[PDB]
Amino acid sequence: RTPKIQVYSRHPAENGKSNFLNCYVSGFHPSDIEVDLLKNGERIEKVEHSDLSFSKDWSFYLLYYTEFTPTEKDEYACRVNHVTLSQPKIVKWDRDM
Amino acid sequence: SGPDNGAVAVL
Amino acid sequence: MGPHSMRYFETAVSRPGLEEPRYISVGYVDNKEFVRFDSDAENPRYEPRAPWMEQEGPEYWERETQKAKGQEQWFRVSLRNLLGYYNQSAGGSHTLQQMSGCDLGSDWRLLRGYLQFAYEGRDYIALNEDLKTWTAADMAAQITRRKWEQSGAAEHYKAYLEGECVEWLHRYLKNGNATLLRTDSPKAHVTHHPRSKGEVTLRCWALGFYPADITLTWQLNGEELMELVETRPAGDGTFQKWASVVVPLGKEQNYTCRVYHEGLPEPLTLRWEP
């Protein structure tokens, strides 16, 4: 029961306009998990997250988020570490998704 | 108002 | 969308050494969190998570907090019993979960009652729709099932589901009415993306809607047709979703997206606008 990930912005992205970067992690079990938002491969500090919740199928879900400003060149991603994964799972932010 | 399992058996 | 509902999602996670498990209880009204208890808090108490719950006085919060203290001990003893049923190593990491709740019918009475448990994220034992019989999911759960059939545990849960669950849900719907009736309609738009030689992806976005219930569709010349993402939180209490289709270059205007949401007087129809 590996974590499912979606990485996306709160509002349609526009370069230079302040927004929020979200990483929605769900469908995982057990509940302990490490989720990081990355900027050009480096962990962003002070990322906020929702409190622990679980779905009708028993699996847990969390939202991690931070304020950010989309740019042409900065590469944003979500990195998840979980006991069900053999390695870190990295999902790049794509403003079209 | 949540359930009270205490009035009944544990697993 | 659908029947009014109340749910309590409870979890206990065992911890190492002599440390007691972490216990978390989350309540929902119509799929929105409205109360929470967490044993890891500085002062553990049930707290109002929907602000309309502050209509409840101190006696309410004391009573619910005392109940959570009882649940925490029920989960602790139950985890210890499960360890013996599965002959597992003690002092380890283990998870026990419960879901309970009620859906209401047109007469404000119980439509469907829910009472089920999971161990290590897998079904363990559940009360059937009849609120009289149990479904044991595996062989260890047969031990619990026999014990509970003999002690009449189903009768206790049936009384809670048909009584208290329904009565308190009705009270919360009344107190939360000003918030619970406010809907946020989806704002929709279609984006166009390079796909291949001769093909384009059209993606229909629905953003900033509440409640989460939504339908996104794509039609070709008025006939039904598609990649869908799971509905996801925007982070502000509203939700997002998109639906995309692969379309031949030059035929983009033949496709329409339709968005169905309870906040809308009528469904939205839109197309790619070059």
CA-nearest of C97, C55, C240 to A31 is C97
Residue A2, phi-psi category: left (phi > 0), alpha (psi -120 to 50), beta (remainder): beta
* Count of other CB atoms within 10 angstroms of residue A87: 6
Same domain membership, residue C250 and residue C155: no
Cis previous bond, C21, omega within 30: no
User: In a mutagenesis test of the C interface, which of A49, A52, A56 is the best target, namely the one with the most C β-carbons within 10 Å?
Assistant: A52
Same domain membership, residue C198 and residue C168: no
Buried residues in C13-46 as b, exposed as e (16+ CB within 10 A): bbeeeeeebbbbbbbbbbebbbbbbbbeeeeeeb
Chains that touch B (3 or more CB pairs under 8 A): C
CA-nearest of C67, C154, C177, C165 to C110 is C165
Give the span between the Cα atoms of C246 and C226, in whole angstroms.
Answer: 8
Do C and A make contact, counting contact as 3+ CB pairs within 8 angstroms? yes
Same domain membership, residue C239 and residue C137: no
As for how many domains chain C has, the answer is 2
Binary contact (C71, B11; C-beta < 8 A): no
* CA C234 distance to own-chain centroid: 17
Tell me which residue range forms the domain holding C12.
Answer: 1-182
Contacts of C36 in chain B (CB under 8 A): none
Same domain membership, residue C225 and residue C106: no
Same domain membership, residue C136 and residue C121: yes
Give the span between the Cα atoms of A93 and A74, in whole angstroms.
Answer: 10
Give the span between the Cα atoms of C91 and C83, in whole angstroms.
Answer: 10
Same domain membership, residue C122 and residue C16: yes
Give the angle C156-C158-C161 at the CA atoms, nearest 5°. Answer: 110
Same domain membership, residue C29 and residue C75: yes
Angle between helices C153-162 and C141-151 (to 10 degrees): 80
Same domain membership, residue C213 and residue C201: yes
By Cβ distance, the residue of C64, C117, C125 closest to B1 is C64
By Cβ distance, the residue of C78, C160, C165 closest to B10 is C78
By Cβ distance, the residue of C64, C124, C147 closest to B9 is C147
Domain-terminating residue out of C152, C182, C212: C182
Resolution in A for the shown PDB structure? 1.5
Same domain membership, residue C23 and residue C148: yes
Number of H helices, E strands in chain B: 0, 0
User: In a mutagenesis test of the C interface, which of A50, A54, A59 is the best target, namely the one with the most C β-carbons within 10 Å?
Assistant: A54
Beta strands C199-209; C215-220: pairing state? unpaired
Domain-terminating residue out of C154, C182, C210: C182
Q: How far is CA C257 from CA C122, C218, C243, in A?
A: 38, 5, 9
Q: How was this structure determined?
A: X-ray
Q: Which chain B residue is nearest to residue C84, measuring alpha carbons?
A: B11
Angle between helices C153-162 and C164-175 (to 10 degrees): 30
Binary contact (B10, C64; C-beta < 8 A): no
Domain-terminating residue out of C133, C153, C182: C182
3-state helix, strand, coil in chain C (%, to 5): 25, 40, 35
Same domain membership, residue C192 and residue C152: no
Give the closest-approach CA distance of B1 to chain C in angstroms.
6
Binary contact (C100, B7; C-beta < 8 A): no
CB C122 within 8 A of CB A1: no
Which residue matches tokens 């031990």?
Answer: C143
